[PDB]
Symmetry: C3
Subunit: 112 residues, 3 copies
Amino acid sequence: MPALVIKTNAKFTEEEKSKATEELGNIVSKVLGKPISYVMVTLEDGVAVRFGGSDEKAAFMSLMSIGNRAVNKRASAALTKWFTDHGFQGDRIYIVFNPKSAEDWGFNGDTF
Amino acid sequence: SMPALVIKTNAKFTEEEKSKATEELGNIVSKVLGKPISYVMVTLEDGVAVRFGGSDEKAAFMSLMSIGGLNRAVNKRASAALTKWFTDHGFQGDRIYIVFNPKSAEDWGFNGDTF
Amino acid sequence: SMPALVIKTNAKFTEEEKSKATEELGNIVSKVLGKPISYVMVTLEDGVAVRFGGSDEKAAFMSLMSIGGLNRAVNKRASAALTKWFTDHGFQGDRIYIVFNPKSAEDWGFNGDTF
């Protein structure tokens, strides 16, 4: 099951945040080959961000999935496109990939 | 060697409710991990936009980091005890997400020094 | 080789204090890590419920991610330099908790591409 954690200094409305987690979650499902059921998306807006010395609009992202280099390039491009289509500049978008193991994952009070 | 629990959720808590939660969740981590009750760092972020399984219904994402001390047996006990806290406080156990991140001694800092 | 610093704290900052803080803390990361400020990313979330050592007194949790470039030798200088900022800005040094998490080149993304 993949997880996407997003921090940004942009301010979103509740409607914008709800739509965003839906669209970004659907992007993760398509690129990663998992059903939408397994996708967890977290969005924290209005956090103080400084990237390259500037506090201009920016976004930081971490993607955790239970089990590569090929997919990460594809994931990087698809997630960035959403932000560039919503007022962001592609050089202010930052993604970190952290794949994890089954025993290090919990759900419904049990591991895998 | 103090473990850390980082919690993000879309539920809305009052200030008193957040205060009780960090104490209770922290005490749970300490008991299961065999660490003293005090020696535990807990972070709780409420009111964050969360979507799990397509739904933005009440959900919680958690990361538990400990320098070692996270084998498969302990993780199952911690997952169960933490989930019990959430199911006892209005959550559904299938909306609770836990990640375990074992780490190294040189990769952990406290009081300006690593271990 | 861009570094990333993620900060959670229960202290309350004005917008100006947060703005000064991301600049000062970022410059520290650039200094300790030997990288230019152009490649440095800093995120600061204040007013999060934090309990460290049983107390909800002012405390801070930090994660520092760098593509390699993190031996224990740097980790101690980074831990000390980062802690000094907090002890100089109203925090107690034994309430400051830092995680170092080096990641691999294939595990890092920017501008739609990995390294």
